Symmetry: C2
Subunit: 228 residues, 2 copies
C-alpha cells in the first residue's frame, strides 16, 4: 500500500488548487511520488479524492496535518463533514468545507479569524466576500438561481448558501428556531440542492425553491468560493 | 428559544439510557425542566433527538460538554458523524458512535482506553465484548443476518459490524487494499445496511450479502451494543 508524505500532499494540493484557478474543473489525474521508494503514480480522480479524504479526516479530527497518508480508499470528492464548534461559526465552517473541495484547506478557526466572526453578530455576507482573499479565495456573489449554482459546480467551485431557518420550516423541516444560517452547496439533483449544513449534516437536501426563497428580507445571493 | 442546562441534559440522558435497558425501544416523550423558567417541557422523539444531536455536536467537536443546549432543531436520532483519529481506532470509534444512539456518550479515547486498543493490533471482537461493560454496555454477539440486525435495531440497539475491506471490493467499492475494519450499523433499507464507517462517512450503504459474507476466515458475528 503506497503512502505519501506530508510534503508530497501539500505539493499535490497546491497543484490541485492551481489547476482549479482555470475554472475548467478537476484534472484528469494528479502526479504523486510515494515516500518509500519515490516511484511516480498517476492517481485518477477517485484515487486522489480518496487520498485527500483520508488526509482531511485526520486533519479535522486531530487539528494537525498528518505526517503521511496511505492510499486505502476511493471517493467522489475529498469532502469530510465538519461541524461548527460554536453556535455562531456557521459561516467560517462553511468556508472551511469549501476549502476542502478546492484542495486549499483552512480550518474553521482560521476562517473565523479571517472573516471577523463574532459572538454577537455572526458573520455578514460582506464580511465573507471582503475577507476571503486573506485565505487565498475569491467569492463570487451569484443570483439565487439553480442554473447559476449548477454552472459554478461544473467549474469545480462549491457555493456557500445563506438563509433564515424559520423560512425553511415547512419546505424542509430541519429547524424550529429563528436565526440566519450558512451552509455549503456541493452537489445538486434535478430538484434539490445538496447542502453540507454545519449544524445538521453533510447531505441536507433543499428543494431549489425552498432555499431560494428562505432569505426573504435579506441579501438575495449565494456565494461561490473559488481560487483568488 | 427553550434551553436546557447541562445538568438536566445529563439526567435526561441517564433516564433515556435506563429506559432503553428494558429492550422496549425509545420512550414516547422525554420530560425535562427548562433552565430560565424552570418549567416542565414534554419533548417528542424529534425534539429530544434534535436536542441531543446538538449536544453531541458540541461535545464531539470541542471535547467537553456544553453548559446548555438550546432546542433549535429536530432529527430522527441524535447520531453525529465521528471519525477515527488514527488508522487503528475504528472499533472504539464505532462503540462511541453507538454510545450516542444509546444516550450514554463515551468519547473515542474513553472507549479506546477501556477496550485496550493498541497501535499494533487494533482491537479484537473478544476485547470489545469483554471490556465494553467498563463503559456501561453489554455486547450481544449475533448472527451476520439482516433478520437479526433488524430485530435489535427495533429495540433501539445499534450493531457494530466487522468485515475485511478487500472482500467487499467488488460488491461495494469503498476500499482498495487489505485490512480488517469496524463500523456501526444504525439503520437499514429493504436491501442494504446503513453503516457509519469511521473512515469514510455516516451512511455507507452495504447490501445485506456484501457485508454478511465479507468476513470469511474471521469470526462470523455482528455485535449488538446495549445497556448493561
Amino acid at each position: 500500500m503506497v503512502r505519501f508524505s506530508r510534503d508530497m500532499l501539500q505539493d499535490g494540493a497546491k497543484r490541485m488548487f492551481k489547476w482549479l484557478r482555470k475554472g475548467e474543473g478537476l484534472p484528469n489525474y494528479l502526479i504523486m511520488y510515494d515516500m518509500d521508494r519515490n516511484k511516480e503514480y498517476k492517481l485518477v480522480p477517485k484515487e486522489y479524492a480518496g487520498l485527500y479524504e483520508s488526509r482531511n479526516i485526520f486533519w479535522i479530527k486531530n487539528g494537525r496535518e498528518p505526517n503521511y497518508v496511505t492510499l486505502t480508499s476511493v471517493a467522489r470528492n475529498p469532502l469530510v463533514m465538519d461541524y461548527q464548534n460554536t453556535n455562531y461559526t456557521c459561516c467560517p465552517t462553511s468556508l472551511s468545507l469549501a476549502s476542502q473541495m478546492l484542495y486549499h484547506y483552512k480550518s474553521e478557526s482560521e476562517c473565523a479569524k479571517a472573516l471577523g466572526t463574532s459572538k454577537g453578530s455572526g458573520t455578514s455576507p460582506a464580511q465573507l466576500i471582503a475577507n476571503a482573499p486573506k485565505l487565498g479565495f475569491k467569492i463570487i456573489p451569484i443570483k439565487r438561481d439553480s442554473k447559476e449554482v449548477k454552472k459554478y459546480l461544473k467549474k469545480g467551485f462549491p457555493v456557500i448558501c445563506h438563509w433564515q431557518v424559520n423560512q425553511s420550516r415547512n419546505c424542509k423541516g430541519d429547524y424550529t428556531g429563528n436565526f440566519g444560517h450558512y451552509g455549503l452547496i456541493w452537489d445538486m439533483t434535478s430538484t434539490h440542492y445538496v447542502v453540507a449544513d454545519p449544524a445538521k449534516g453533510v447531505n441536507r437536501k433543499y428543494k431549489f425553491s425552498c432555499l431560494d426563497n428562505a432569505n426573504k428580507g435579506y441579501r438575495q445571493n449565494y456565494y461561490v468560493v473559488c481560487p483568488a
